[PDB]
Amino acid sequence: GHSYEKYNNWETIEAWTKQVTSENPDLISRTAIGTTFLGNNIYLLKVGKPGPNKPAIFMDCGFHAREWISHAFCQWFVREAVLTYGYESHMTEFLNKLDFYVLPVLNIDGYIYTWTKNRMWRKTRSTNAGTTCIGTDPNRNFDAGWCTTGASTDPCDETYCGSAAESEKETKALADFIRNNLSSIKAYLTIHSYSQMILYPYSYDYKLPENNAELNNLAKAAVKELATLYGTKYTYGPGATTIYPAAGGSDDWAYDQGIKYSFTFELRDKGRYGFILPESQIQATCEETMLAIKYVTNYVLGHL
Ligand SMILES: CC(C)[C@H](NS(=O)(=O)c1cccc2nsnc12)P(=O)(O)C[C@H](C(=O)O)c1cccc(CN)c1
Ligand SMILES: [Zn+2]
């Protein structure tokens, strides 16, 4: 019961990750980088023509449970990658020279919760000591300026930074994988909604990254490319000044690990529907986003 033009529940996404791997065993392999608080496998797909010691780009979706278009996009990306490999020259070059690590849904427990009990949930669903309030904000749970500006120490708050950095099994798993694979990963892309933005470091402080001038030009070019299809307008810049400070983010943590091309995407829209983006907009949203991801990928290959 899977569709690329509808939002799919976790049972369906899980089945899809196995399906797309089985159909394309020579281009895709699947692993589980860990388990969620509730015991669900956290899947990662490795998309590319297999080879020794290839560079890689890492992309995840579904950090935040309610941001359903994010999850939708990782699925769209994988189909497009397989469908156009061997057919379109650029994607064919891409998957020959590098690997894509695609993590379709990080916060699986929260996503299940938005389908069963509360469409507007954001955090994980781990329990907290001493309170009935549930969950930690995964994008405040990484070891980058942890629990300083833009995060809450209150477990009942939506930006609760957690009992400690990487306290959540899900974020521990992601950080672990990246650490173990640091030599290969040239870029980190993390998909959110909404607001139509491309963000880069820093978010935990107002200081600018060493390669600020390069990241700004790249984001500028990427939003230009995105707009070419349907005229969708993105803003861009350092996280802290471009939206608000948010310490403990995975893009900042990836960057300070040495991954110099680290971007957060905020997809459609700009508040008309917000997180409840109509299914009729999924295809158009994913198509234009593909153009930006491919632009950044082509850039990375030329700047290894
Ligand atoms: C609507 C977008 C902007 C989400 N922010 S939100 O907390 O859900 C939110 C929704 C509605 C109104 C709001 N006012 S302030 N935050 C709001 P986000 O969750 O995707 C933003 C993301 C985060 O808060 O983790 C983010 C903010 C700043 C910087 C970065 C990159 N590290 C990421
Ligand atoms: Zn988000």
From Swiss-Prot:
Substrates-to-products reaction catalysed: Preferential release of a C-terminal lysine or arginine amino acid
Active site: E266 (proton donor/acceptor)
Cysteines engaged in disulfide bonds, as pairs: C61-C74, C133-C156, C147-C161
Binding site for substrate: H64, A65, R66, E67, R122, N139, R140, S193, Y194, Y244
Primary site of residence: secreted
Cell location: Secreted; Zymogen granule lumen
GO cellular component, one term: extracellular space
Protein name, as recorded: Carboxypeptidase B
The species this protein was found in: Sus scrofa (Pig)
Recorded name of the encoding gene: CPB1
First and last residues shown, out of full length: 113 to 416 of 416
